[PDB]
Design a protein around this nucleic acid. Sequence first.
RNA 1: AUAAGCAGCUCAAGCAAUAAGAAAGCGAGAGCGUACCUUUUGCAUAAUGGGUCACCAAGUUAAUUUUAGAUGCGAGCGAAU
RNA 2: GUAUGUCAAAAGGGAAACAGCCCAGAACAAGAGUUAAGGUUCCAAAAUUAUUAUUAAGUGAAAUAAAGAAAGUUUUUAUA
RNA 3: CGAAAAUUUAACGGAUCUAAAUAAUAUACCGAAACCUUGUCCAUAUGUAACAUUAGUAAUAAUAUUAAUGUUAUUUGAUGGGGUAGCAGAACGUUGAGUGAAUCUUAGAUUUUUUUUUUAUAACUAAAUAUAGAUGAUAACUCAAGUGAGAAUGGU
Lengths: 63, 183, 98, 62, 133, 138
Amino acid sequence: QSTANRTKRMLNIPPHESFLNVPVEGDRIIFNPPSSEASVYHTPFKFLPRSDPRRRANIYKLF
Amino acid sequence: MSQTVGATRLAYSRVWHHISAVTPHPTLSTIKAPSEAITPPSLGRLASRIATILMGKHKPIWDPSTDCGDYVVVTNCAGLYTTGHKKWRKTYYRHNTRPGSLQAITMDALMEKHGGAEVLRKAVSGMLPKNRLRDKRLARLKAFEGDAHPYKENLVRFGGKVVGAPGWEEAVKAIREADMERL
Amino acid sequence: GGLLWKIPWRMSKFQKLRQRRRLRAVDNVVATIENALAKKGETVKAVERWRAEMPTEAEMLPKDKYTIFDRKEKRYRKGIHKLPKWTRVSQRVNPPGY
Amino acid sequence: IRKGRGPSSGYGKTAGRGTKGQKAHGHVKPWFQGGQTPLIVSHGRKGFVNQFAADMSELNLE
Amino acid sequence: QPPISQQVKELLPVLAAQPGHYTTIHIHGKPYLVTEGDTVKLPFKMPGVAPGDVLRLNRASVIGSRDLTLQGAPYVDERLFECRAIVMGTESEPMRVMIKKKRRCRKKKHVFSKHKYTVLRINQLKINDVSSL
Amino acid sequence: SFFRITLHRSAIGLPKRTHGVLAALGLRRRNQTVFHPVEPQFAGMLMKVKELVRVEEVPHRLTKRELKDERKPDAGFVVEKQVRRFIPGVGVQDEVDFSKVGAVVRDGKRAGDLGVRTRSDWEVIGKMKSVLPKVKAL
RNA sequence: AUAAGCAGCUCAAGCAAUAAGAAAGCGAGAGCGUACCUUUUGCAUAAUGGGUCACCAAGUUAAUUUUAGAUGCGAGCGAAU
RNA sequence: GUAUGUCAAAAGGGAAACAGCCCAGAACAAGAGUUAAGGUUCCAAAAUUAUUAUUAAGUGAAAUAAAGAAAGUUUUUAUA
RNA sequence: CGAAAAUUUAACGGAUCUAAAUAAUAUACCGAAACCUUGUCCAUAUGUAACAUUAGUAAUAAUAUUAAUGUUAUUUGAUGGGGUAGCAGAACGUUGAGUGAAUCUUAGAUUUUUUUUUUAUAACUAAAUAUAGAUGAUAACUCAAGUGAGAAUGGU
Ligand SMILES: [K+]
Ligand SMILES: [K+]
Ligand SMILES: [K+]
Ligand SMILES: [K+]
Ligand SMILES: [Mg+2]
Ligand SMILES: [Mg+2]
Ligand SMILES: [Mg+2]
Ligand SMILES: [Mg+2]
Ligand SMILES: [Mg+2]
Ligand SMILES: [Mg+2]
Ligand SMILES: [Mg+2]
Ligand SMILES: [Mg+2]
Ligand SMILES: [Mg+2]
Ligand SMILES: [Mg+2]
Ligand SMILES: [Mg+2]
Ligand SMILES: [Mg+2]
Ligand SMILES: [Mg+2]
Ligand SMILES: [Mg+2]
Ligand SMILES: [Mg+2]
Ligand SMILES: [Mg+2]
Ligand SMILES: [Mg+2]
Ligand SMILES: [Mg+2]
Ligand SMILES: [Mg+2]
Ligand SMILES: [Mg+2]
Ligand SMILES: [Mg+2]
Ligand SMILES: [Mg+2]
Ligand SMILES: [Mg+2]
């Protein structure tokens, strides 16, 4: 295109569908598991020490 | 800039999708009721969905300059669905620049020589950007007349179940449940 | 003629929708002005003339919203999108019978 | 004002004369009125100039 | 102050516990998705800031982690999170010349533009413990 | 009450008489809002440009400084800590931390007056050879 | 060396510094863009002129008559003794 | 000739390409900002979004070829 | 159906469409250098404060203020912004000249380049090459012009 601003609009990609359902009259937390490969810092529950209280049911099971 | 800092390997990989030109498509059909009247995707409505895959426009990382397209295996092209009287009244024209040398052929006569796969390649070709990537993208459309093709092992799978198979959706939901057992 | 002014003879369903909303928006400007004055017990001669001999978008026939009267036409009718500045000009009444 | 020294000066090229005509190519006589006869030829000159009158140096009492 | 939702009071600890967190701050209405350590280059010269000033951002539309996302209706409540930046000076662009000109008209008018930009550095992005609230 | 008139469309191709109606209302450019009393003289002025403006009855008039505050976005930041700054008109203004709250501006004709550490201040710190941190701190 | 660009502009992979530090340049690929001037109601026009580069090349001076601003003197001014 | 406007001397969006038409008057950048005309399956930014009918001719879908003919079809109004 | 023309499908822009056609409606979205928001540039104002220069007026042995000009900031959260013919204002650059018997230069003046920075038709930082003490260069202000060229089937 002629200008950089026009190129930005033609190459636009909307955000994920989950980020479009904005709440009203308050704040909320939604479960949004991304379709991506998790890193190695998300340790599985099997590799967590017994003492670690962070071990907990799946986030799905909290909703 | 964090959102795009990471491994982009699998975002640019070529996925081998599959679709049958005979299987009814509730989304790409104009007859949405009753259940028995749902037709397959028409020639141009199937081609418009394929041209979107060949361009990689279904991805959130799409860029017209980068060739982030995928493969599409279209089977059962002999039973390509068409409305009205297109099959016997639509004409394809060709010229070689020499006056007098205009070549015309009907859709049914073009399906007797090169099958229905050629009629689909012409539709998808005209729906792709006219640039230096048009022939690469159109080459990733592997259309066959019957159910046989050499890519039955390339089709994307999830848990051993080919996408579009009877039980592929349940195989996908079972793998994501185990993914949540981590910090 | 050889100069090409490619103006179609009919309007599209999109132009017709905005024409409906432009006629309906001028109805709100005349009603707001007429209601604001009525509270003060006042009237304007131009606002009383409009409400008298001009219809609202809900009282207009489909052929009066998208067409005008041209005597040089086969059936004395012409697309309203052929009028100069038709988008910013008021046109709702045509000769009787035509 | 230096005429004919670029467009951005404001007096470039035509140099205030416009495009063509007598007033760009050559010069128009000052007394010319296009052809119409002047008012001094249509009405004539009125009176004469006294060449024998004295030029007094007026002096007032104030 | 309006009390925080009970549904937000039970899942915020799960959101703050995950490894990484991101936020979408809003400076003068324009959003900027940032993380602790990012360098935001604002498209304007913030007036009244010198290299070394510490700001406190308070308009965040989204504070989320991998799986969990906290979305405020107009914005997220300032009590839940804490975000701060530091001004790293201002930067400039190379002078770009625009030539306004018409066909068959020798005059070429020039426009010289050289704008400045303030650079920030997100040095703190933490989610508060809301057990007391 | 008043009329809240906003110019929605332009008049680039309309007659010159339509430009004089928009000028009498005060509408110079697009999307400009002007407030006028509810009177026939102004009501009849809007019937000529009723295809270009948007009218709304409002109780009170909004000042110029109040029409612009409804489109002003929240800054989104608060300067909590400032550094030592020299102001040309006033003088040096020491660093302040608004989180623990003090804009003290010291002006003078000698270095000591500004409140900064001079060469003399650095020589008294170098002669304090007896100062030492407490053993517990160390 | 699969391609139909007034050769620029917008987005930009990649290559490019033996080495701590340091990337100008070239740019695949995507998009936008039909030279300039003159003359005309109107020119990408298949209307005018120019092979390229460097240099030479066009409102100036004189007398005369005026205006504006500034400034000296002032019912006097200027010139000259 | 008259009335009005644009171009001329006005770039930009739309009309496939476009001096004169529909919008809109370019000081310079940033923004999934807000809008006009115009549009939203793909080329190509945005609906394969909803409701009710008609057409089977690719008619048509952004430049209406006529009078006319006819067990083409639909609806309405009579009527057996 | 009527409906036939000569390079090629040949006025859906094309692919294609049984709606993605047509008619009567409804909503959302996209959409310009338009508008808004946040900054910047330029023009013209209105007050105030500060910095500098020049020229006055006072004070000072035990510095303040007045006026003009330049400049930055700030108040009204000031207003304004396409352009031919044409009119007007403000500046840069070039050649020579005065201050100049001045200023600077092997501790590198000057070097047609490259490079760097600065709102920038200009200058500046550095690098490289060479080697000048004046028949060298030069800030600032001012004076005078053989003073600014992609355009004349121009000239050499
Ligand atoms: K003149
Ligand atoms: K020639
Ligand atoms: K000359
Ligand atoms: K040099
Ligand atoms: Mg023609
Ligand atoms: Mg001019
Ligand atoms: Mg003159
Ligand atoms: Mg000429
Ligand atoms: Mg003339
Ligand atoms: Mg090649
Ligand atoms: Mg081209
Ligand atoms: Mg002619
Ligand atoms: Mg030519
Ligand atoms: Mg010369
Ligand atoms: Mg003058
Ligand atoms: Mg005009
Ligand atoms: Mg002309
Ligand atoms: Mg235009
Ligand atoms: Mg179109
Ligand atoms: Mg948007
Ligand atoms: Mg699209
Ligand atoms: Mg057709
Ligand atoms: Mg065609
Ligand atoms: Mg503007
Ligand atoms: Mg303007
Ligand atoms: Mg020449
Ligand atoms: Mg020659």
